[PDB]
Structures are given as structure tokens and as C-alpha cells.
Amino acid sequence: FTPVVLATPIPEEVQQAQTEIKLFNKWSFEEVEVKDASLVDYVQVRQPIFVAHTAGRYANKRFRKAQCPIIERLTNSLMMNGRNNGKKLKAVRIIKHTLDIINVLTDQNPIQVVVDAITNTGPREDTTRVGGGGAARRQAVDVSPLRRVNQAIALLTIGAREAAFRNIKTIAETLAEELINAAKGSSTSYAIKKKDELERVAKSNR
Amino acid sequence: PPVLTSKDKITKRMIVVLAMASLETHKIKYVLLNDDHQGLLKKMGRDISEARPDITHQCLLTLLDSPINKAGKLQVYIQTSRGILIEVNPTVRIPRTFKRFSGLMVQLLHKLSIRSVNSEEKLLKVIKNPITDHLPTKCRKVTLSFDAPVIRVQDYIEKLDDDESICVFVGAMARGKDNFADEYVDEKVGLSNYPLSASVACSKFCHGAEDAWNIL
Amino acid sequence: MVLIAVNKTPEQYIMDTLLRIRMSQLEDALMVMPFSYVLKFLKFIDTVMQNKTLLHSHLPLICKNLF
Amino acid sequence: TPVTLAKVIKVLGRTGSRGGVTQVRVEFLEDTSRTIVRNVKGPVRENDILVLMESEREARRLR
Numbered sequence: 341f342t343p344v345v346l347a348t349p350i351p352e353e354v355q356q357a358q359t360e361i362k363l364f365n366k367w368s369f370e371e372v373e374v375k376d377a378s379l380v381d382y383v384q385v386r387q388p389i390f391v392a393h394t395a396g397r398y399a400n401k402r403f404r405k406a407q408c409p410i411i412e413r414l415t416n417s418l419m420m421n422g423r424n425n426g427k428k429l430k431a432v433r434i435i436k437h438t439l440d441i442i443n444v445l446t447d448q449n450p451i452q453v454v455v456d457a458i459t460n461t462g463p464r465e466d467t468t469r470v471g472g473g474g475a476a477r478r479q480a481v482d483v484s485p486l487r488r489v490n491q492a493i494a495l496l497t498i499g500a501r502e503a504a505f506r507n508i509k510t511i512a513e514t515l516a517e518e519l520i521n522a523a524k525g526s527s528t529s530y531a532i533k534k535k536d537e538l539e540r541v542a543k544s545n546r
Numbered sequence: 547p548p549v550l551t552s553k554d555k556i557t558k559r560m561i562v563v564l565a566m567a568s569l570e571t572h573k574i575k576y577v578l579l580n581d582d583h584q585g586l587l588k589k590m591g592r593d594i595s596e597a598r599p600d601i602t603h604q605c606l607l608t609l610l611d612s613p614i615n616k617a618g619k620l621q622v623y624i625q626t627s628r629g630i631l632i633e634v635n636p637t638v639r640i641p642r643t644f645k646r647f648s649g650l651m652v653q654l655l656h657k658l659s660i661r662s663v664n665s666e667e668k669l670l671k672v673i674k675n676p677i678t679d680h681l682p683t684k685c686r687k688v689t690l691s692f693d694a695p696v697i698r699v700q701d702y703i704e705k706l707d708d709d710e711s712i713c714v715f716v717g718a719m720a721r722g723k724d725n726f727a728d729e730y731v732d733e734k735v736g737l738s739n740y741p742l743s744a745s746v747a748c749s750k751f752c753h754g755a756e757d758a759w760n761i762l
Numbered sequence: 763m764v765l766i767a768v769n770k771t772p773e774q775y776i777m778d779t780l781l782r783i784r785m786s787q788l789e790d791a792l793m794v795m796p797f798s799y800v801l802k803f804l805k806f807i808d809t810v811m812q813n814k815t816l817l818h819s820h821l822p823l824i825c826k827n828l829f
Numbered sequence: 830t831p832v833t834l835a836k837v838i839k840v841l842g843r844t845g846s847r848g849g850v851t852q853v854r855v856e857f858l859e860d861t862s863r864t865i866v867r868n869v870k871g872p873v874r875e876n877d878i879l880v881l882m883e884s885e886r887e888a889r890r891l892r
Binding site for chain 1: 834845846847849850867868869870871872873874877878879880881882883886888891892
């Protein structure tokens with residue numbers, strides 16, 4: 341045996357961690373699993389990825405979108421609102437810097453904080469504008485698991501971009517602020533407020 | 547004290563919306579409908595309840611002269627009878643006369659905003675419907691109605707949380723049904739066992755709020 | 763110790779809705795109904811079989827809905 | 830909190846003026862052999878898992 345370094349050299353940590361474990365840049369794809377007894381196979385994780393860049397053919401089927409990696413689905417939700425359309429290299433970069441922040445404060449490998457922020461803000465029921473004749477009332481309905489995945493990431497990237505709007509604190513700072521206050525139920529973030537405001541109306545008008 | 551706008555959603559405050567207001571323009575120079583045209587309402591094919599801006603000027607001089615505005619926990623949003631939703635900056639100076647107020651409202655409706663005479667900020671803004679996007683996140687919404695149960699102001703304000711704001715909707719009209727916000731509010735509340743004007747209910751909820759929030 | 767569904771016995775209306783319904787897409791209206799609809803439903807079959815009536819229905823209809 | 834999980838077993842048909850609410854009979858997971866017909870809001874296919882809020886309530890018609 342005894343493999344040597346070749347004519348074209350490779351750094352040692354690149355040699356070390358990659359062949360041993362199918363990790364992230366620097367993050368494992370062993371542990372954290374789902375703590376919710378739902379949303380399975382809407383959670384893509386296992387399969388693992390290196391970076392969140394893939395020409396993913398997940399769009400032309402009703403449910404192949406759920407097989408997109410949720411970390412790359414985060415990057416899909418960032419690069420919008422006019423000034424960020426395109427710019428996928430921008431969004432992948434900020435995700436890396438955000439994962440730098442979260443794994444420092446109370447390490448808890450930071451895809452845990454990703455998974456917990458999705459499961460704990462999905463509105464488990466919702467209302468629609470049901471007609472009833474002229475005066476369009478509302479009726480409580482239990483929304484799909486796929487839209488609960490959809491509405492989870494939506495409230496994250498909207499509220500974090502508005503929080504980083506017209507201040508010193510950046511996108512990566514305010515988005516990490518949203519994830520910590522939503523991995524634990526705190527209602528100091530944008531979404532856990534907006535999750536509870538949707539779920540209190542459907543209880544009122546049931 | 548900080549000046550409160552729609553951009554701040556966090557600070558606990560009190561917001562009043564003069565919904566269903568009477569803001570109608572008229573050509574002769576563009577003038578508001580009222581005094582000046584009460585003998586020409588039918589002549590223009592118009593309505594009487596569509597000619598009541600004195601209630602609106604009265605309630606603006608009610609709310610904006612309240613000490614909770616001077617304490618800085620109050621916002622005023624105005625919806626017309628046609629549904630025109632308006633953000634009011636609480637540091638604005640309303641003219642006490644009906645004439646300068648009237649030209650100010652014509653200038654507001656045609657110029658779609660009023661700006662500062664000294665700085666780079668909007669004194670008045672025409673905003674989009676719905677209201678709940680412009681409202682803060684945690685906020686109780688109630689509709690004043692004589693046909694709603696009568697409660698006390700101070701206790702029900704003391705039922706609120708430390709972060710939950712309060713907003714109230716007032717139909718700025720002479721008469722009619724109070725069904726303009728069935729699509730919006732959590733609760734219809736009454737203030738008295740007697741029928742009131744709008745500004746008296748405004749001073750009731752203002753002064754009860756200042757008794758509850760310890761504003762002197 | 764109600765004037766109308768229609769008849770001296772109300773169960774005749776129960777078969778009559780089976781008479782009025784089209785032969786196609788009736789399973790879509792039947793598949794909505796819960797288990798309590800069945801518990802309320804078989805009493806009418808016992809009603810027509812103790813009634814010995816085959817004038818306003820027929821056995822492939824009743825066995826068709828049963829199946 | 831009375832969290833209740835339900836599994837989709839079949840699709841039934843479309844009801845409502847908005848055209849996104851689907852009548853679905855589901856079978857709830859814990860202590861099975863009882864079923865409830867409910868109304869979803871988003872896109873659901875069969876053998877999906879939803880979270881029931883109330884225990885015993887069903888709707889049948891939306892205008």
C-alpha cells in the first residue's frame with residue numbers, strides 16, 4: 341500500500357477528511373436526524389453534498405422538488421428581490437459564512453439549527469378565503485407537508501432580508517439571528533411570530 | 547422620544563385607523579365636498595354622508611393633540627369611504643381651521659404624499675391595502691361599535707402582553723353599519739351604554755390607555 | 763311511555779335518491795361518506811327486507827351499493 | 830398539546846371556490862381502525878402525513 345502524494349500536490353486535510361467521511365466542506369453527514377414524526381422524504385439529507393451547487397433537475401415533476409437538498413433550497417430562497425437574481429455564487433458564499441457563525445455559539449452542529457428552524461415554524465393549519473356568499477369568510481384547513489416546507493424557508497429569508505435592511509448588520513448575521521431564535525421556540529424572530537399569528541386565527545374561526 | 551412609523555413593528559404602541567372617512571374632491575382649483583356644497587349635493591348627483599370631513603378633522607385634532615402622541619406611543623392611519631389608506635406621521639402639524647386643512651387634504655390626495663417643510667421625511671403618505679402588512683406583528687384589533695359589548699378600557703389594555711401592540715378601527719361616518727372590518731379584527735368592543743360620536747370614543751380609548759400605560 | 767321526505771315511510775325517499783342518481787360517477791358521491799353513514803344506512807336495508815318491497819328498488823341496486 | 834398525526838389513504842374529489850382545497854379521507858396513525866374525512870390546503874399525494882389540531886371535527890362543503 342503506502343500512497344504517496346502525486347506530481348500535482350493536494351493539501352493534507354483535503355486528503356484526510358474527504359475520503360474518510362462524505363462530509364460538507366467541514367461538516368459531517370452523520371448525526372442530526374429529524375426530531376419530528378413527519379416531513380420525511382421532504383427532507384433530502386442523506387443524500388449528502390459537498391457544496392450547495394448542482395444543476396438540479398427537480399423542477400419538472402410535482403414532487404421531485406422535495407428531493408432537492410434543503411441547504412441548496414436555502415440558497416434558492418436567497419437570490420431574489422431584483423438585486424440578487426442570478427448571483428448563485430453570492431448565495432453559496434453567505435451560507436458558508438452563516439455556518440461559520442452558528443457552529444461557534446453553542447456548536448450543536450449547525451444543520452441541527454437548520455432542521456429545527458424548519459420543523460418548528462411550519463403552520464400546521466391555515467385559513468383560506470372561503471366565499472360563503474358575498475362576505476368572504478375564512479375556514480381552517482390543514483395545509484400540506486410540502487407547503488409547510490415551503491412556508492418555513494419563505495418566512496426565514498423574507499424576515500432576515502428585512503432585518504438586514506437599512507442597518508449595519510449584514511445578511512449572514514441577521515439570518516443566523518433568525519435561525520437561533522427559531523430553532524428554539526422564542527417568538528423573537530420573524531417567523532415564530534408569524535407562525536403563531538396564523539395558527540391563532542384558525543383556532544378562533546374554526 | 548423616538549418617532550414611530552410603519553417600519554417599526556416591534557415597539558408596543560397604540561394605533562387608530564379612521565376607516566370609512568369622507569374624502570371627496572370636486573372641481574369648480576380642486577375643492578373638498580361638504581358647508582360649501584350642501585345645497586349642490588343633489589345638483590352634482592352626490593350623497594350627504596359622502597360630505598362629512600369635519601368628523602375627520604375633529605378626530606385628527608382629537609388624536610394628534612392627545613398626550614399619548616406627546617408621549618409617543620400612537621400612530622394614525624386613515625381609510626376613506628373609497629378605501630384610500632393613509633399613513634400619518636405623528637409629528638405633523640394639523641391646521642385648526644377647516645380651510646387650510648381642506649387645501650392640505652386636496653394637496654394630499656392629488657400629490658399622493660405630503661413631505662416635510664424642513665427635512666427629508668414624509669409628513670403624510672398614501673399606502674396600499676391591506677392594513678395588516680402595515681401593522682405591527684403582535685397587535686390586538688378591535689372594532690368600536692355601540693352594538694358590541696361594553697367593557698372598561700384600562701383593564702382590557704392590562705390584559706395585553708408586554709410586546710403586543712393595540713390598534714382600533716373607527717368608522718368615520720355620520721351613520722350606517724359598523725361592518726367595515728369584519729374581515730380584519732379579533733373583537734368588537736363597546737365603550738358606553740349610550741351612542742357616541744367618533745371623537746368621544748377616541749378620547750375614551752386614548753384616556754383609558756393613558757390611565758393604563760401611566761401617561762401623564 | 764316533518765311533513766316530507768316523501769312517503770308514508772321515509773325510507774322510500776332513500777331508495778328514490780338511488781333511483782334519481784345516474785348510473786355513472788355515483789361512487790364519487792358514495793366514497794365521501796363516513797362509517798356512521800353505514801350504521802345509519804343498513805337500517806333501511808333491514809327496513810325494506812322486513813318490508814318485503816321490491817317495487818321501488820331492485821336487488822342489484824342494493825347489492826351494488828353494498829358492494 | 831394534543832398533537833395528532835394522520836396518514837392519507839385515498840383521494841376523493843375537489844370542493845371549494847378557490848380550487849385548491851381537496852376533500853381527503855385520512856387514517857390517523859396512533860390507535861388506528863378509525864378514519865376522518867378532512868380538507869387539505871396544499872398539494873397532497875397519497876400516503877402523506879399531516880398534523881391534526883382538533884381531534885373530532887370534519888368539514889364537508891366549502892362554497
